[PDB]
Design an enzyme around this catalytic site. Structure first.
Site, mmCIF file in Angstrom:
data_model
loop_
_atom_site.group_PDB
_atom_site.id
_atom_site.type_symbol
_atom_site.label_atom_id
_atom_site.label_comp_id
_atom_site.label_asym_id
_atom_site.label_seq_id
_atom_site.Cartn_x
_atom_site.Cartn_y
_atom_site.Cartn_z
ATOM 1 N N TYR A 3 8.386 6.001 -9.364
ATOM 2 C CA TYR A 3 7.169 5.709 -8.672
ATOM 3 C C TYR A 3 5.951 5.409 -9.534
ATOM 4 O O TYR A 3 4.868 5.956 -9.337
ATOM 5 C CB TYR A 3 6.918 6.717 -7.538
ATOM 6 C CG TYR A 3 6.244 6.094 -6.278
ATOM 7 C CD1 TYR A 3 5.003 6.599 -5.889
ATOM 8 C CD2 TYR A 3 6.811 5.077 -5.492
ATOM 9 C CE1 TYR A 3 4.362 6.118 -4.747
ATOM 10 C CE2 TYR A 3 6.173 4.552 -4.365
ATOM 11 C CZ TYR A 3 4.924 5.075 -4.013
ATOM 12 O OH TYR A 3 4.300 4.728 -2.848
ATOM 13 N N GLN A 42 11.579 15.536 29.387
ATOM 14 C CA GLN A 42 10.617 14.477 29.683
ATOM 15 C C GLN A 42 9.481 14.636 28.706
ATOM 16 O O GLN A 42 8.951 15.745 28.503
ATOM 17 C CB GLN A 42 10.203 14.458 31.160
ATOM 18 C CG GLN A 42 11.481 14.396 32.029
ATOM 19 C CD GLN A 42 11.232 13.894 33.469
ATOM 20 O OE1 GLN A 42 10.992 12.650 33.667
ATOM 21 N NE2 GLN A 42 11.245 14.882 34.431
ATOM 22 N N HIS A 55 12.500 4.282 1.522
ATOM 23 C CA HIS A 55 12.271 5.043 0.290
ATOM 24 C C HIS A 55 13.389 6.031 0.027
ATOM 25 O O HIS A 55 13.624 6.282 -1.127
ATOM 26 C CB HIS A 55 10.990 5.902 0.297
ATOM 27 C CG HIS A 55 9.728 5.108 -0.005
ATOM 28 N ND1 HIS A 55 9.604 4.300 -1.117
ATOM 29 C CD2 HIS A 55 8.587 5.025 0.677
ATOM 30 C CE1 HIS A 55 8.391 3.791 -1.112
ATOM 31 N NE2 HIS A 55 7.750 4.147 -0.005
ATOM 32 N N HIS A 101 1.035 0.055 -4.819
ATOM 33 C CA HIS A 101 0.694 -0.532 -3.520
ATOM 34 C C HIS A 101 -0.071 -1.860 -3.658
ATOM 35 O O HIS A 101 -0.301 -2.585 -2.668
ATOM 36 C CB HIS A 101 -0.033 0.376 -2.431
ATOM 37 C CG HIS A 101 0.685 1.634 -2.034
ATOM 38 N ND1 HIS A 101 0.556 2.759 -2.788
ATOM 39 C CD2 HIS A 101 1.583 1.846 -1.059
ATOM 40 C CE1 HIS A 101 1.331 3.673 -2.252
ATOM 41 N NE2 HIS A 101 1.955 3.158 -1.184
ATOM 42 N N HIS A 117 9.810 1.611 6.509
ATOM 43 C CA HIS A 117 9.338 1.593 5.140
ATOM 44 C C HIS A 117 9.612 2.910 4.465
ATOM 45 O O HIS A 117 10.088 2.970 3.376
ATOM 46 C CB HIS A 117 7.848 1.271 5.138
ATOM 47 C CG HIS A 117 7.171 1.331 3.798
ATOM 48 N ND1 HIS A 117 6.576 0.215 3.190
ATOM 49 C CD2 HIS A 117 6.897 2.441 3.096
ATOM 50 C CE1 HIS A 117 6.063 0.675 2.052
ATOM 51 N NE2 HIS A 117 6.259 2.012 1.941
HETATM 52 C C1 LIG Z 1 4.282 5.918 3.788
HETATM 53 C C2 LIG Z 1 4.481 5.539 2.351
HETATM 54 O O1 LIG Z 1 5.380 5.954 1.537
HETATM 55 N N1 LIG Z 1 3.536 4.794 1.995
HETATM 56 O O2 LIG Z 1 3.565 4.355 0.722
HETATM 57 C C3 LIG Z 1 2.466 4.334 2.975
HETATM 58 C C4 LIG Z 1 2.945 3.164 3.799
HETATM 59 C C5 LIG Z 1 2.149 2.965 5.085
HETATM 60 C C6 LIG Z 1 2.009 4.180 6.068
HETATM 61 C C7 LIG Z 1 2.868 1.797 5.691
HETATM 62 C C8 LIG Z 1 1.200 3.797 2.286
HETATM 63 O O3 LIG Z 1 1.151 2.556 2.291
HETATM 64 O O4 LIG Z 1 0.283 4.696 1.652
HETATM 65 C C9 LIG Z 1 -0.925 4.062 1.100
HETATM 66 CA CA LIG Z 2 8.469 17.827 28.786
HETATM 67 ZN ZN LIG Z 3 5.823 3.404 0.347
#
Ligand SMILES: *CC(=O)N(O)[C@H](CC(C)C)C(=O)OC
Ligand SMILES: [Ca+2]
Ligand SMILES: [Zn+2]
Ligand SMILES: [Ca+2]
Ligand SMILES: [Ca+2]
Ligand SMILES: [Ca+2]
Length: 316
Positions: free
Chosen positions: A157, A61, A146, A231, A142
């Protein structure tokens, strides 16, 4: 852990009650045996050392406030796997049923979540900018997305290919939120962002400009921060994706919407078959058009809506 599969109940970050899949062996663990090679959730105990301890509970739980983020990370990782398997025929992030691992309670007041190359990590937030990040299904999907990108296109990246990387995550995290029918929208992290403010979100797909993100290629960020705006520039892509699915007129360019199902199908196909680590926005356009052509024919409305969409956002 080796044990007996069983089913527990808990409460998530948002106070919602859910059943989770667990494993019994003296303790009850947050180990789900039902999905691939398993879903494992760890306690990072406010430290940065990963993965931490596999989550152990004495009575199956999970109602304590400390339990909240673990429930959600575990559950939403389950839904994400389900979406991939059911909708795109993909078994886990590698396509080979690799175990999914998540660590919660990472650091103190940590305002983010991430895929580190081998597992997901979730901070608890500072309680004002964010609440425990795993309470957002779109955040969980999200991040796991990745993992998917890493194993498929491998988009670097940074710069344009990283903006694409970010947008695919946003696209598929939204699709997963609609898939679960968990109050769906075209926003990112609304459920966990700024617990005091209502109606906001971290990023908008429908209108990236709302928050200052570009919604046109001519407005793209050319600097240095954020890995060259990974971003920031993702908003050009998110806008394009929104228009294909929903339709609309943007900067005088009219797009007939073809729906979210088809958007998910063209994008998954571009990601898995046509995108490379170095792809740029203009190569994404080509990859999308070609996926749409493969699926629907060169003279389809689908293909015609993808072109409009990119044209509306200034990509080619
Ligand atoms: C989590 C990730 O890889 N990110 O790029 C995050 C996403 C958010 C938590 C939705 C991010 O946007 O960092 C600025
Ligand atoms: Ca518990
Ligand atoms: Zn991301
Ligand atoms: Ca929502
Ligand atoms: Ca959302
Ligand atoms: Ca808010």
């Amino acid at each position: 852990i080796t044990g007996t599969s069983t089913v527990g109940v808990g409460r998530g970050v948002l106070g919602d009650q859910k059943n989770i899949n667990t494993t019994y062996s003296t303790y009850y663990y947050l180990q789900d045996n039902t999905r691939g090679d398993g879903i494992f959730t760890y306690d990072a105990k406010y430290r940065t050392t990963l993965p931490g301890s596999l989550w152990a509970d004495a009575d199956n739980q999970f109602f304590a406030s400390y339990d909240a983020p673990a429930v959600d990370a575990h559950y939403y990782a389950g839904v994400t796997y389900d979406y991939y398997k059911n909708v795109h025929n993909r078994l886990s992030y590698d396509g080979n049923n690799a175990a999914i691992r998540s660590s919660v309670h990472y650091s103190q007041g940590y305002n983010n979540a991430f895929w580190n190359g081998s597992e997901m990590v979730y901070g608890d937030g500072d309680g004002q900018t964010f609440i425990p990040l795993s309470g957002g299904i779109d955040v969980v999907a999200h991040e796991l997305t990745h993992a998917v990108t890493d194993y498929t296109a491998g988009l670097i990246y940074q710069n344009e290919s990283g903006a694409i990387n970010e947008a695919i995550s946003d696209i598929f995290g939204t699709l997963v939120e609609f898939y679960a029918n968990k109050n769906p929208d075209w926003e990112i992290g609304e459920d966990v962002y700024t617990p005091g403010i209502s109606g906001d979100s971290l990023r908008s797909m429908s209108d990236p400009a709302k928050y200052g993100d570009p919604d046109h290629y001519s407005k793209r960020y050319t600097g240095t921060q954020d890995n060259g705006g990974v971003h920031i520039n993702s908003g050009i892509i998110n806008k394009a994706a929104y228009l294909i699915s929903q339709g609309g007129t943007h900067y005088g360019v009219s797009v007939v919407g073809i729906g979210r199902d088809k958007l998910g199908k063209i994008f998954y196909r571009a990601l898995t078959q046509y995108l490379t680590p170095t792809s740029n926005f203009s190569q994404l356009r080509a990859a999308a058009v070609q996926s749409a052509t493969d699926l629907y024919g060169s003279t389809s409305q689908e293909v015609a809506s993808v072109k409009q969409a990119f044209d509306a956002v200034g990509v080619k």
